[PDB]
Design a protein around this ligand. Structure first.
Ligand SMILES: *[C@@H]1O[C@H](CO)[C@@H](O[C@@H]2O[C@H](CO)[C@@H](O)[C@H](O)[C@H]2NC(C)=O)[C@H](O)[C@H]1NC(C)=O
Ligand SMILES: *[C@@H]1O[C@H](CO)[C@@H](O)[C@H](O)[C@H]1NC(C)=O
Lengths: 49, 49
């Protein structure tokens, strides 16, 4: 309640108290590099048709 | 149903015994008290939202 003075009673509040600190980044166990050759570093490309 | 009766100008009906009847009247009074956290519903756990 956006004020510096509060009247007597019971009120409902937001969280305002806990925030995360750490991080979990678990991804699969692959490691082989994708074949950017023969797609970018290739000898011949086909016709558009 | 129809119970047509015409008229009379010298007759009167008197009831000779009675019955005590107990009836039930059903009336709502109050409804459930519900509160909403606007930020949690709209945005959840995102700071940008
Ligand atoms: C009007 O009075 C008569 C009696 O004069 C009632 O008939 C009696 O009903 C009760 C039960 O409620 C019995 O125990 C009695 O035995 C009955 N009569 C007698 C004295 O034998 C009648 O029920 C009363 N009015 C209404 C329509 O309830
Ligand atoms: C009503 O009452 C009067 C009294 O004089 C009588 O003449 C008349 O016939 C009555 N009519 C009915 C509705 O019976």
């Amino acid at each position: 309640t956006k004020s510096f003075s509060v009247e007597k009673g019971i009120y409902q509040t937001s969280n305002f108290r806990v925030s995360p600190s750490t991080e979990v980044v678990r991804f699969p166990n692959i490691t082989n590099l994708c074949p950017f050759g023969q797609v970018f570093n290739a000898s011949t490309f086909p016709s558009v048709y | 149903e129809d119970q047509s009766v015409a008229y009379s100008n010298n007759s009167i009906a008197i009831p000779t015994n009675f019955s005590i009847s107990v009836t039930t009247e059903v009336l709502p009074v109050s409804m459930t008290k519900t509160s909403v956290d606007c930020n949690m519903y709209i945005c959840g756990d995102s700071t940008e939202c």
